[PDB]
Amino acid sequence: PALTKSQTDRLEVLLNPKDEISLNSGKPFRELESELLSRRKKDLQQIYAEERENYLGKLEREITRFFVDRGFLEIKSPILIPLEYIERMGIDNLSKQIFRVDKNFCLRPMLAPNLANYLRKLDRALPDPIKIFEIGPCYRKESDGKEHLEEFTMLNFCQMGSGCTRENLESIITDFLNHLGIDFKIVGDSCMVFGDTLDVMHGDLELSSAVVGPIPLDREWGIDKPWIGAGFGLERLLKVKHDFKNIKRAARSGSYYNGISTNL
Amino acid sequence: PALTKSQTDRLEVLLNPKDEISLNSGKPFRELESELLSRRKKDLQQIYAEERENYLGKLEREITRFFVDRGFLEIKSPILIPLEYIERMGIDNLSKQIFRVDKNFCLRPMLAPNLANYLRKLDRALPDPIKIFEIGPCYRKESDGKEHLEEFTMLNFCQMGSGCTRENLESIITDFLNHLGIDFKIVGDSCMVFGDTLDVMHGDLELSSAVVGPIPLDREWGIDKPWIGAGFGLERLLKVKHDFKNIKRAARSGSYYNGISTNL
Ligand SMILES: Nc1ncnc2c1ncn2[C@@H]1O[C@H](COP(=O)(O)OP(=O)(O)OP(=O)(O)O)[C@@H](O)[C@H]1O
Ligand SMILES: Nc1ncnc2c1ncn2[C@@H]1O[C@H](COP(=O)(O)OP(=O)(O)OP(=O)(O)O)[C@@H](O)[C@H]1O
Ligand SMILES: N[C@@H](CCCCNC(=O)O[C@@H]1/C=C/CCCCC1)C(=O)O
Ligand SMILES: N[C@@H](CCCCNC(=O)O[C@@H]1/C=C/CCCCC1)C(=O)O
Ligand SMILES: [K+]
Ligand SMILES: [K+]
Ligand SMILES: [K+]
Ligand SMILES: [K+]
Ligand SMILES: [Mg+2]
Ligand SMILES: [Mg+2]
Ligand SMILES: [Mg+2]
Ligand SMILES: [Mg+2]
Ligand SMILES: [Mg+2]
Ligand SMILES: [Mg+2]
C-alpha cells in the first residue's frame, strides 16, 4: 500500500496542522481520504453554524481597530496606480516583478508611494505628528513557493514629524506583535529602494521591513521631515498564527476557506 | 468679480454638501477659498481627533456584520482572475470595459463568477440553503462621469437551494436598505449576461441589479439548483448617504478623505 504522488497531494490538501494523522501510516488512500473529508466537512459546517468570518477579513478588522485606537488615520488608496510611481520609487528598469495594466498603469507592489503622498498632503492640515496606515491588496510576480504569493495583503503604518526615532519604531512593532501574540527578533538588512532596513523576523520568516528616515528618496515625494514606517504581510502573520505549511492556505482563494480545502 | 473656470473648479473641490455657501454670491475667490479651506481643515482635524475610520472601510465592516448575522458566509476571493471567466460569463468579444493583465488575466469586473464557483463547491459540504457574500474591488473601463468609477467596490450576496424566490430576494434587499436608511423602488430591466433583472433604484440612480435563477448560463458554472443574488456598488450607497454630487468623493483616492479634499 504505497501512495502515488497524486494521492499524497490530495491528502496534503485535506490535512490541517492540528491533525495527528500520518499519510505514511500504512492505511490505504481510501480510508485516509474518507477520514480527512469527514473532518473538513465538520470543520466547515462548524464555521458556517457559528462564526462565518473570513480569516483575512477578520485580521484586517482587528489590525484596523488596533491602529485607529492608537491614533493612526485609516487610509484606502488606489490599487491600480501609475507606472510612473515605479520609476519614482527608483525601481529602475525587481522591475520584472511588476504586473502591467494597459500602457501607463500597474498593480501596486507596495503601499509606500500612496502613503508618502498622504503624509505630504496631510502635513498641511493636521497637528504634529502625522500618523496613518493602510491595509489592502498588493501584487508581485514571484517564483512559486511556500512564503510568496502573487496577490497578497499588506499593512503599512507610518509616522512623520516628532517621535520618529528607532526606539519609537521598535516600540510600536513590539506592541503590535505582542497584541497578536507573535514572537519575533529584529535584524539589520538593506534594499535598493529604502537603504538600510530593520527586518522583523519570526525564525527565518520575514514578517516586515521597517525604515527610519530621512532617506535620499524623500525629495522625490516631497517629504522633508523625519519619518518612520513598517510594511507587514497579513498572509505571513496568518501562516504563523495557524501554523500553515504553505502560504496558499491563507490567500484569497477559491481553493481554501480559512485554511480548509473547498474541494470536498 | 467674475470667477474663472479654474477658480470655480477649485472652490467646487473644497465645497461639501452641508455648506450653505454659494460660489456666485459675489464674494471674491480669495475669501471663498479661505473660508472653505478653514472649514475643511477643521473637518479633517475633527476626524483625526475623534473618529479616524475611512468611509469605504467602515461601510464594508457594517455590511459584513449585517450579512454574517443573517447567516451568510463571508468570502474574500481573487481580484486578479482568468480572462477565460469573461468568455464563460458570455461577455462575448461591454468586453471593451475589461482591464487586461498580461496574456491570460484580467481585473474582475464583477463578483458573480467567483461566487458561482463557491456556491457549487460549498453545496457539497454545507446544509441547504447555501448563503454567501463578498465585498471588494471591481474594475470597468468607463466613460467618465458622476455615477461611474473605473475602480469601485462591489457587494454581492446570493443564496442557492430552498427559499430562492422573488419574494425572498425582495425581502432581503428591503431589510438591507432599511438597515442603511436608504429609500428605493424596484423596476424590471435586462442585460446580456443574466437576462431579466430586478433593478433597485434610488431615483434615477441604479443601486443594484438582482436576479432570480435558474438561468441558462447556470450549466457553464455547474449550478443546478434555484438561486437568487444581487450586486450593489458601495460608492453609490455612500453617494446617497452623504449627498455627494460626484461619485469620486466616495472613491479610493489620494484626492479626497471621507469626502474632504486633501489638497489643503
Ligand atoms: N510575494 C509576497 N507574498 C506575500 N507576502 C509578501 C510578498 N512580498 C512581500 N511580502 C510581505 O510584505 C512585507 C514588506 O515587503 P518587502 O518589500 O520588505 O518584502 P521582501 O523584503 O521583498 O520580502 P522577501 O525578502 O520575503 O521577498 C514583507 O516583509 C512580507 O511580509
Ligand atoms: N463603473 C461603476 N462604478 C461604480 N459602481 C458601479 C459601476 N458599475 C457597476 N456599479 C455598481 O455595481 C452594481 C452591479 O453591477 P451591474 O452590472 O448591474 O451595473 P450596470 O447595470 O452596468 O450599472 P450602470 O447601468 O449604471 O452602468 C450596479 O448596480 C452599481 O451599483
Ligand atoms: N519597505 C516596506 C515599507 C517601509 C515603510 C514605508 N512607510 C511609508 O509609507 O511612508 C514612506 C514615506 C517616506 C518617503 C519616501 C517614500 C516611501 C513612503 C514595504 O515595502 O512594505
Ligand atoms: N448582475 C449583478 C449580480 C447578480 C447576482 C449574482 N449572484 C451570484 O453571485 O451567484 C451567481 C450564481 C449563478 C450561476 C451563474 C453565474 C453567476 C453567479 C452584478 O454584476 O453585480
Ligand atoms: K498535520
Ligand atoms: K490570490
Ligand atoms: K453645498
Ligand atoms: K480609484
Ligand atoms: Mg521580495
Ligand atoms: Mg526581504
Ligand atoms: Mg523586506
Ligand atoms: Mg454599466
Ligand atoms: Mg444598469
Ligand atoms: Mg445593472
The CATH number assigned to the domain holding B156 equals: 3.30.930.10
* Residue B69 Cα to ligand 2 middle (Å): 26
Instruction: Looking at chain A, list the stretches that DSSP marks H as alpha helix, in order from N- to C-terminal side.
Output: 5-14, 29-50, 55-69, 83-88, 112-122, 166-180, 234-242
Element (H, E) at B231: strand B227-233
Can you tell me the distance from the alpha carbon of B75 to that of B127, in angstroms, rounded to the nearest whole number?
17
User: Taking phi first (over 0 means left), then psi (-120 to 50 degrees means alpha), and beta for anything else, what does residue B222 get?
Assistant: left
Residues 6+ apart with CB under 8 A from B184: B173, B177, B200, B201, B202, B207
Q: Does B62 lie in the same domain as B22? A: no
Distance CA A134, CA A155 (A): 6
Q: Could you tell me which residues come within 8 angstroms of residue B106 by beta carbon, excluding any fewer than 6 positions away? A: B80, B81, B82, B83, B86, B98, B99, B100
Number of compact structural domains in chain B: 2
What's the gap in Å between B189 CA and the centre of ligand 13? 8
Ligand 1 pocket mutation, candidates A148, A184, A199, criterion most atoms within 8 A of CB: A148
Q: B40 with B63, same domain?
A: no
Determine whether the shortest distance from the Cβ of A223 to ligand 3 is under 6 A: yes
Give CA–CA dist A21/A144, Å, rounded.
Answer: 27
State the distance from the centre of ligand 1 to the C-alpha of A205, rounded, in angstroms: 10
Please give, rounded to a whole number of angstroms, the shortest distance from the CA of A187 to a CA of chain B.
Answer: 32
Residue among A177, A154, A141, A150 nearest A231 (CA): A154
Q: How many CA atoms lie within 13 A of B233 on its CB side?
A: 27
Q: Which among B166, B223, B228, B234 is the best mutation to test ligand 4's pocket, defined by most ligand atoms within 8 Å of the CB?
A: B223
Residues A124 and A76 in one domain: yes
B73·A151 Cβ contact <8 A: no
Residues B21-54: b if buried by 16+ CB within 10 A, e if exposed:
eebeeeeebeebeeebbebbeebbeebbeeebbb
B15 CB-near residues (< 8 Å, 6+ apart)? B21, B23, B36
Quote the cell numbers at residue B209. Answer: 441589479
Q: CATH no. for residue B41? A: 1.10.287.540
List Cβ neighbours of A139 (8 Å cut-off, separation of 6 or more): A99, A107, A108, A109, A150, A151, A152, B80
CA–CA separation, B49 and B78 (whole Å): 35
| A52: region left, alpha or beta (phi > 0 left; psi from -120 to 50 alpha) | left
Are residues B74 and A68, on separate chains, in Cβ contact within 8 Å?
A: no
Domain boundary among A32, A52, A72: A52
CB contacts of A48 in chain B (<8 Å) are 73, 126-127
Q: Could A74 and B61 be called an inter-chain contact, meaning their C-beta atoms sit closer than 8 Å?
A: no
- Residues of chain B with Cβ-Cβ distance to A253 below 8 Å are 77-78
Task: Please report the number of interchain residue pairs, chain A to chain B, with beta-carbon separation below 8 angstroms.
Answer: 130
Ligand 3, atom 3, residue with closest C-alpha:
A231
Chain A nearest-CA residue for B115: A254
Helix (H/G/I), strand (E/B), else coil: A73:
strand
Q: CA of B2: how far to CAs of A68, B6, B12, B19, in Å?
A: 44, 12, 15, 21
Cell numbers placing A115: 502613503
From ligand 6's centre to the CA of A127, what distance in Å?
Answer: 39
Same domain? For B89 and B11 the reply is no
Task: Pick the closest to residue A117 from A107, A104, A130, A128 (CA basis).
Answer: A130
| Among A41, A78, A126, beta carbon nearest to B45 | A126
CB of B77 within 8 A of CB of B115?
Answer: yes
> What DSSP character marks residue B38?
H
CA nearest to B252 within chain A: A77
Domain identity same for A255 and A124: yes
| Angle ∠(B89,B92,B93) on CA atoms, nearest 5 | 135
Q: Which ligand is closest in space to the CA of residue B132?
A: 4
Q: How far is residue A56's CA from residue A76's CA, in Å, rounded to a whole number?
A: 16
Give the separation between CA B224 and CA B42, rounded to whole angstroms. 56
List Cα–Cα distances, A247 to A176, A198, A233, B71, B233, in angstroms. 21, 23, 11, 28, 31
Which residues of A are less than 8 Å from B107 in CB distance?
80, 101
Are residues B58 and B12 part of one domain?
A: no
Are A52 and B74 inside 8 Å of each other by CB?
A: yes
> Are B150 and A252 inside 8 Å of each other by CB?
no
Report CB contact under 8 Å: B101, A107.
yes
Place of cell 488615520: A73
User: Which grid coordinates are listed for A50?
Assistant: 457559528
**Nearest ligand to the C-alpha of residue A111?**
3
Distance CA A161, CA A125 (A): 13
Q: Which three cell numbers stand for residue A181?
A: 501574540
Cβ neighbours of A71 (radius 10 Å): 12
- Are A94 and A13 members of one domain? no
Place of cell 497584541: A179
Task: Kindly state whether residues A39 and A69 are assigned to the same domain.
Answer: no
Return the number of other C-beta atoms located less than 10 Å from residue B1's C-beta: 7
Question: Do residues B148 and B248 share a domain?
Answer: yes
Kindly identify the ligand whose nearest atom is closest to the C-alpha of B36.
Answer: 7
Domain boundary among A13, A29, A52: A52
**B189 to chain A nearest CA, in Å?**
31
Q: Kindly state whether residues A69 and A1 are assigned to the same domain.
A: no
> What is the CA(B7)–ligand 3 centre distance, in A?
34
Instruction: Give the residue whose CA is nearest to atom 7 of ligand 4.
Output: B229
d(CA A102, CA A45): 43
Helix (H, G, I), strand (E, B) or coil at B74: strand
φ, ψ for residue A153, nearest 5 deg: -125, 125
CB contact under 8 A, A52 and B75: no
CA of B206 to the centre of ligand 13 (A): 6
Whether residues A60 and A111 fall in one domain:
yes
DSSP reduced 3-state for B151: strand
Q: Which residue has its alpha carbon closest to ligand 3 atom 14?
A: A218
Contacts of B84 in chain A (CB under 8 A): none
Residues B185 and B117 in one domain: yes
In angstroms, the CA A109 to CA A115 distance is 13
**Residue carrying the nine cell digits 501596486:** A108
B233 CA → ligand 2 middle, Å? 6
How far, in Å, are B20, B38, B159 from residue A122 at the CA level? 26, 14, 43
Q: Which residues have C-beta atoms less than 6 Å from ligand 4?
A: B 110, 112, 115-116, 119, 154, 156, 158, 194, 209, 211, 213, 217-218, 221, 223, 227, 229-231
- For this PDB entry, the determination method is X-ray
Residue range of the domain that includes A45: 1-52
